[PDB]
Each structure stands twice: as structure tokens, then as C-alpha cells.
Amino acid sequence: GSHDYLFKLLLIGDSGVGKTCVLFRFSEDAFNSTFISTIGIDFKIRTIELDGKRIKLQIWDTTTAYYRGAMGIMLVYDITNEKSFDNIRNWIRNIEEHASADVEKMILGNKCDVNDKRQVSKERGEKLALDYGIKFMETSAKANINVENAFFTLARDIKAKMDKK
Numbered sequence: 216g217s218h219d220y221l222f223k224l225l226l227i228g229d230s231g232v233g234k235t236c237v238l239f240r241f242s243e244d245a246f247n248s249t250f251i252s253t254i255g256i257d258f259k260i261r262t263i264e265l266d267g268k269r270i271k272l273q274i275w276d277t278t279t280a281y282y283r284g285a286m287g288i289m290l291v292y293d294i295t296n297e298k299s300f301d302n303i304r305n306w307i308r309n310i311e312e313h314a315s316a317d318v319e320k321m322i323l324g325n326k327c328d329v330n331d332k333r334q335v336s337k338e339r340g341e342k343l344a345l346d347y348g349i350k351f352m353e354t355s356a357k358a359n360i361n362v363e364n365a366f367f368t369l370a371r372d373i374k375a376k377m378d379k380k
């Protein structure tokens with residue numbers, strides 16, 4: 216090594232988009248468990264393996280002094296809620312103002328399992344992401360679609376930058 220890695224990640228997005236479920240699916244493989252109380256757990260930690268190294272992810276759930284340690288940000292909307300998607304512009308603008316200069320970013324279109332109630336097309340999300348030069352994927356905390364993908368991707372981008380300088 217013998218460097219150790221702890222990446223502080225932040226979930227941000229409108230109330231109700233699934234931030235807490237994303238966090239608890241990734242860290243406990245749970246969704247609407249009757250055994251887990253989520254109140255008021257501020258973060259969860261999961262360790263992943265990258266390049267043979269054990270990377271600690273400290274993932275926080277819901278102005279500068281708010282983005283203080285954050286190295287990566289998941290910008291979350293709900294594919295069944297157009298307004299939550301529309302507010303992503305605003306979240307991006309806030310992050311640009313108050314977060315670290317080079318914070319790594321990713322947009323998540325969550326609840327992609329609810330296809331009969333979809334209000335935001337995958338195409339709309341992809342185009343918005345492409346416009347800001349931000350990575351994108353559709354997720355489901357319920358079905359465990361792209362939740363690991365999202366975190367592994369962001370972590371890789373943080374590590375790649377950190378391993379340069």
C-alpha cells in the first residue's frame with residue numbers, strides 16, 4: 216500500500232426521491248425492512264475493493280460548511296416525479312457554488328422499476344447529464360439495479376484523481 220482510503224460521499228436530491236433507500240440498499244441490502252429503523256442515521260459505511268485496495272465509503276444522507284468533506288456527490292431524482300428531475304438543475308447550481316472545486320458528480324434516475332408511473336424518460340436524463348458533463352445511470356433501490364454500479368463508478372473516479380495527485 217500502504218495508503219488508506221476513506222471517501223466521503225453525499226446523497227442529495229428532493230425529499231422523496233429515494234436517497235435513504237439507496238443508502239440502505241447499498242449498505243445493508245435492505246429495502247423497506249421491518250427490522251431496520253432508519254431514523255436518524257446520518258451515514259452508512261461500506262468497504263469496497265478497487266485495485267486490490269480496501270476503499271471505505273462513508274455515505275451521508277441529507278451552505279459551504281455542508282459540502283465540507285464531500286469528495287463525491289450522487290444527485291438523485293425520481294423517474295416518476297418530473298419536479299424532482301427539474302430540481303436537479305438547481306442542485307447542480309448549489310453544488311457548483313458551495314462544494315469543493317473538483318467534487319466528483321453523478322446523476323441517478325431512481326425508481327426505475329416503476330415503469331408504469333414514469334414521468335421522466337431515460338433519454339431526458341441522459342441528455343441533461345451529457346449537457347453538464349456529468350455521468351448518469353438509472354437506479355432502483357427496490358430491485359438493486361445500478362446501486363453498486365453507481366458507487367463503484369464514483370469511487371473509481373475519485374481514486375483515479377487521488378492516485379494522480
Ligand SMILES: Nc1nc2c(ncn2[C@@H]2O[C@H](COP(=O)(O)OP(=O)(O)O)[C@@H](O)[C@H]2O)c(=O)[nH]1
Pocket residue numbers: 228229230231232233234235236237247325326327328329354355356357358
Ligand atoms: N419502487 C421504488 N420505490 C422506492 C425506491 N427508492 C425509494 N422508494 C420509495 O420512495 C419513498 C421515498 O424514499 P426515501 O428513501 O425515504 O426518499 P428520501 O426522502 O430521498 O430519503 C419510500 O416510500 C421508498 O420506499 C425504488 O428504487 N423503487
Ligand SMILES: [Mg+2]
Pocket residue numbers: 234235276277
Ligand atoms: Mg431520507
